[PDB]
Amino acid sequence: KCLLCRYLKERQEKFISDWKKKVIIRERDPYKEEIIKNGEHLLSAFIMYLKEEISLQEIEITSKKIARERIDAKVNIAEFIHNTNVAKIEIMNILTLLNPDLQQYQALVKKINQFFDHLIYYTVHSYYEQKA
Amino acid sequence: KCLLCRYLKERQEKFISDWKKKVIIRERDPYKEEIIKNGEHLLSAFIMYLKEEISLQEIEITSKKIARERIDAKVNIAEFIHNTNVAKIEIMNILTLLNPDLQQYQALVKKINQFFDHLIYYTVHSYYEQKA
Ligand SMILES: [Cl-]
Ligand SMILES: [Cl-]
Ligand SMILES: [Cl-]
Structure with missing residues (x-):
């Protein structure tokens, strides 16, 4: 019941490579490599979410990390x-x-x-909570 | 060519009334009244955007204000x-x-x-830029 899921699962690597070229990542950023790992992880979580295999709460760990x-x-x-x-x-x-x-x-x-x-909500919320 | 616009234009006072019941707005907020006025303004702007009468740049000033x-x-x-x-x-x-x-x-x-x-992007961006 999800061609989009099958598509993304097969094309994960290509999707991330294309996305990397379109995002804003500064050469000075000490975590520029983690940005890519976070993206890879969350794409995987997205697929699982569309398949109803995780709840949204399960991405909150990654949001706090970001x-x-x-x-x-x-x-x-x-x-x-x-x-x-x-x-x-x-x-x-x-x-x-x-x-x-x-x-x-x-x-x-x-x-x-x-x-x-x-x-987006949880990451921005967490950013402000942690920076406080 | 857009029933959504007509519906919102007609039901605008009601939409805002319902919205006010679901949002996080505390009585201690120094701009509680402005939040509602900003909402009313941006709903009107949304309708104009759907009708292709404004560009997205035109809401950036409101984002900076928020x-x-x-x-x-x-x-x-x-x-x-x-x-x-x-x-x-x-x-x-x-x-x-x-x-x-x-x-x-x-x-x-x-x-x-x-x-x-x-x-969302312009308001959060401006928040960070103005706060330093
Ligand atoms: Cl759902
Ligand atoms: Cl109310
Ligand atoms: Cl201002």
């Missing part, structure tokens, strides 16, 4: 928002190209939104 | 993200109920995402 890294990198936390949205936009593009029917499209858009909304 | 107010309120900036998402979710619910076909649904989802992503 937040702490961003604090230490001394970068505007909105860059993380931008970089996350690059991935979301591409996933939406892939969903469109797979050409699901309306019912399926609607179900997947809800899950996509729930995942990314939580990731 | 960010300044949030700094002064001494709240976690993620509360703004939560509050914005409450509106987006309800808009998505209204879109679903209005029963568009897939093509129209996709076109509006893209505009909804673009508007809200820009609002």
Whole structure:
């Protein structure tokens, strides 16, 4: 019941390589390598979430990690928002190209939104909680 | 060419009333009244954006204003993200109920995402830039 999931699972490496070229990563960033690892991990979590194999609470560990890294990198936390949205936009593009029917499209858009909304909300919340 | 706009334009006072019941806004907030006015303004801007009457750049000044107010309120900036998402979710619910076909649904989802992503990104960006 999820071609999008199958597509992303098979194309994980390609998806991340393409995403890396579109994100904002500063050469000075001490965690620039972790940015990629976090992305790889969260793409995997996204697939599992669409398959209803994890709950959203399970990404909160990663969100706290990202937040702490961003604090230490001394970068505007909105860059993380931008970089996350690059991935979301591409996933939406892939969903469109797979050409699901309306019912399926609607179900997947809800899950996509729930995942990314939580990731962004929790990471920014955590950034401010930890920086305090 | 957009029933969603007409619905929101007509039901605007009610939409805001319902939204106010679901958001994080404390009576101690020095800008509690402005939060509602900002909401009213941005709902109008959203409608104009759907109608292709404004560009996304035109909400950046409002984002900077919100960010300044949030700094002064001494709240976690993620509360703004939560509050914005409450509106987006309800808009998505209204879109679903209005029963568009897939093509129209996709076109509006893209505009909804673009508007809200820009609002969240620019406000959080400005919050960090203004706070130092
Ligand atoms: Cl769901
Ligand atoms: Cl109320
Ligand atoms: Cl201002």
